[PDB]
Amino acid sequence: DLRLHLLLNTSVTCNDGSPAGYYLKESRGSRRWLLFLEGGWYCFNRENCDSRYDTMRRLMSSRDWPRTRTGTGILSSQPEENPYWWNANMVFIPYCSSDVWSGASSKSEKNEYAFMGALIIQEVVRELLGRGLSGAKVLLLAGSSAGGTGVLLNVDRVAEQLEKLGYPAIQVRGLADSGWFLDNKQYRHPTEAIRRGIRYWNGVVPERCRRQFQEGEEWNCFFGYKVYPTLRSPVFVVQWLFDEAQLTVDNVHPVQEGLRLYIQNLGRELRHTLKDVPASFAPACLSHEIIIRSHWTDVQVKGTSLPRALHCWDRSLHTPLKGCPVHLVDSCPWPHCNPSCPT
Numbered sequence: 001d002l003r004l005h006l007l008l009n010t011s012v013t014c015n016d017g018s019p020a021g022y023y024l025k026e027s028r029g030s031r032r033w034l035l036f037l038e039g040g041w042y043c044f045n046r047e048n049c050d051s052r053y054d055t056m057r058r059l060m061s062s063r064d065w066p067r068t069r070t071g072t073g074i075l076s077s078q079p080e081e082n083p084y085w086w087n088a089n090m091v092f093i094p095y096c097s098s099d100v101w102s103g104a105s106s107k108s109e110k111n112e113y114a115f116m117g118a119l120i121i122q123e124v125v126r127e128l129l130g131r132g133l134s135g136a137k138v139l140l141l142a143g144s145s146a147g148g149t150g151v152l153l154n155v156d157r158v159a160e161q162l163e164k165l166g167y168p169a170i171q172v173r174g175l176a177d178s179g180w181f182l183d184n185k186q187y188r189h190p191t192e193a194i195r196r197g198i199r200y201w202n203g204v205v206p207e208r209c210r211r212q213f214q215e216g217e218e219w220n221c222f223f224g225y226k227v228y229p230t231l232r233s234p235v236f237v238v239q240w241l242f243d244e245a246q247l248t249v250d251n252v253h254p255v256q257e258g259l260r261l262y263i264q265n266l267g268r269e270l271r272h273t274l275k276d277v278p279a280s281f282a283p284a285c286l287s288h289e290i291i292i293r294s295h296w297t298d299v300q301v302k303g304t305s306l307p308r309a310l311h312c313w314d315r316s317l318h319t320p321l322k323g324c325p326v327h328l329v330d331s332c333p334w335p336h337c338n339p340s341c342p343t
């Protein structure tokens with residue numbers, strides 16, 4: 001139901017120099033626009049990117065992209081599947097820059113690959129303005145995994161470019177799903193790979209965060225709990241307390257005391273980082289599931305589903321609301337202590 005458009009500015013490219021693009025399903029009766037950033041890790045040097053080009057080429061090139069994609073979860077237009085925004089204009093932005101959406105570097109004599117994730121987002125926004133985004137009231141920049149970190153890195157830049165282009169009435173907001181990681185100690189023994197990636201990509205981070213951490217330390221801004229307080233746009237954070245990717249980077253795979261304590265401490269640390277995040281949904285589950293899955297409606301925290309919490313967030317952005325909460329963080333300390341966790 002979402003149709004592919006390759007960028008009209010063909011110099012804004014995927015890793016291999018093929019044009020980037022977006023999939024669009026318009027909803028002409030709606031002033032809501034959802035722009036979703038796909039995830040899929042990243043690559044950080046020539047040899048690592050070459051391997052990714054061999055067996056993850058759709059994440060580095062548009063040459064084999066299909067003409068259409070089906071919107072699912074928060075991108076579904078069916079009310080039953082998407083109680084939150086089923087009538088919105090739907091945009092899926094494929095991740096083909098391998099730079100956690102941070103890059104601003106073209107291919108060249110000296111660069112085998114282009115890392116243009118930050119420019120891809122800006123160009124999608126620019127081209128959408130001529131397709132109806134100029135009439136929007138809300139632009140929700142959403143994303144999962146590397147795309148969720150991408151939201152944190154780019155939401156304020158989207159807000160800034162819309163202001164500079166002359167559209168101050170469009171409210172830009174972020175929804176970061178599964179992109180809120182901790183730079184914690186591993187269970188057995190990362191940030192060095194991000195640190196090297198940033199140099200390889202000419203990666204860019206939000207200005208206020210860059211100014212806090214200063215030169216060489218931009219990697220800090222890839223960690224939600226450090227970049228989020230510097231952001232001005234409203235951002236709703238969705239994060240499993242026991243995210244499978246967090247456990248993977250922590251080298252966690254009949255649980256004895258050391259690992260039990262490690263896992264419990266991870267959940268408490270994650271919960272701590274979300275205490276001052278007023279719009280958040282953080283269930284006590286071991287999962288890698290994301291908000292574009294069709295059954296995203298099923299999980300609840302304190303009896304409230306994520307589509308409900310997002311609706312309550314919309315209302316809050318018109319004092320807390322009777323029966324319509326927006327800060328939903330589990331307090332129970334072990335995976336699947338919430339009975340609604342995905343199986």
Ligand SMILES: O=c1[nH]nc2ccc(Sc3cccc(OC(F)(F)F)c3)nn12
Nearest residue numbers: 039040041145146149181190222245249
């Ligand atoms: O796309 C998917 N699925 N799961 C994941 C997990 C991380 C990533 S990128 C990333 C983003 C922020 C920090 C980071 O460093 C860390 F790992 F936290 F130390 C890596 N992308 N990703």
